[PDB]
């Protein structure tokens, strides 16, 4: 029994062009725990990304926060790429600043 | 207020790739404070909150010895359970355990708990009496009869009512500034058209702690879940949490709708209207 | 502090 990840992509503080911030990818609801999560800037993997220690919810599904400090601009596009056994190909979720 | 200490652990077998991966984390309420990862280089329990760092080296030696000892139990249990379920050696399987204790405002014990899972399903749980167990299936019933006969619950109960509470009491004082706080949600509404005839009202809660919150939509003061939507509460990364709830409404009827926000940090629930 | 005891299943 395998559970597919929920994914949210968002900033720590309200986004302001040229003001430093943190880009978050919160992946939750999944099982088993083995997962690969990458943060992308204009399609390229951001090298320096950190993540929380593995924990799980009351229903035993796992959750992780992946994050990196960033300075948003008007043209730069950000995304989170989740690679999990339940996904036949990796799922890419775009950062929507309003969300 | 009332508070919890909880320990979470995950052991994942890796056949033909060495020892199981074991990861354990400890929390006081929604604040993580320790970790152990059997694949990491330190092979130590490590601090993950500023207010635990002051614990002396004896503490870290104790926590390291005890978390390693639990990892050895779980490794043997992966084999035992594989056998109970007549599973192949080739497959990866997971044991998860969570236990904890709760105290009231004066630090008195309220309740203890322990639950075990196998491959993400219930396996065995301590009952609320702290004296007996509930098994989910015929394999876990083997474990139940064994733990009952050995009076194991008595040792767990002694921890949950004793050590657990004493240490939680200590952490609550050393970490008072972080742990005895309630940060109320900063709230606001957005409004955008979907089309000529419908609009989205989104009710935002930002910067709150603890994570528990309720966001409710009402229509003419009557509860409303038709045509609504809410995201899971999510961590901001700085020790606070975020959530939102939205509703699609007929353009021109925004005034009927209210978002209600309940959080421990609010003296009174908030009602937001457009 | 983590529980110092554990029993196999």
Author numbering:
A (entry chain B): 1 to 99
B (entry chain A): 1 to 274
C (entry chain C): 1 to 9
Passage from the reporting paper:
The major histocompatibility complex (MHC), also known as the human leukocyte antigen (HLA) system in humans, plays a pivotal role in activating T-cell immune responses by presenting antigen peptides on antigen-presenting cells (APCs). HLA-A*30:01 and HLA-A*30:03 differ from one another only by five amino acids, three of which are located in the PBG. To explore the structural basis of the different peptide-binding characteristics of HLA-A*30:01 and HLA-A*30:03, we determined the structures of HLA-A*30:01/RT313, HLA-A*30:03/RT313, HLA-A*30:03/NP44, and HLA-A*30:03/MTB at 1.5, 2, 1.4, and 1.6 Å, respectively.
Here, we found that RT313 also formed stable complexes with both HLA-A*30:01 and HLA-A*30:03 through co-refolding assays. Although peptide RT313 was able to bind both HLA-A*30:01 and HLA-A*30:03, circular dichroism (CD) assays showed that HLA-A*30:01/RT313 (with a mean Tm of 45.4°C) was much more stable than HLA-A*30:03/RT313 (with a mean Tm of 37.3°C). However, HLA-A*30:01 could only bind peptides cross-presented by A3 supertype alleles. Our crystallographic data showed that although the key residues at position 74, 77, 114, and 116 are different in the F pockets of HLA-A*11:01, HLA-A*30:01, and HLA-A*30:03, the binding modes of the PΩ-Lys residue of RT313 in the F pockets of these three molecules were quite similar. Similar to the direct hydrogen bond between Asp116 in HLA-A*11:01 and PΩ-Lys in RT313, His116 in HLA-A*30:01 and HLA-A*30:03 could also form hydrogen bonds with the positively-charged anchor Lys. In HLA-A*30:01, even though residue 116 was His, not Asp, the F pocket still had strong negative charge, thereby allowing HLA-A*30:01 to bind positively charged amino acids, such as Lys and Arg. One mutation, from Asp to Asn at position 77 in HLA-A*30:01, enabled it to bind to the A1 supertype-binding peptides MTB and NP44. This indicated that Asp at position 77 restricted the binding of the F pocket of HLA-A*30:01 to the positively charged residues of the binding peptides. We previously reported that the HIV peptide, RT313, can be cross-recognized by HLA-A*03:01, HLA-A*68:01, and HLA-A*11:01. Together with the current HLA-A*30:01, all of these HLA-A alleles are A3 supertype alleles.
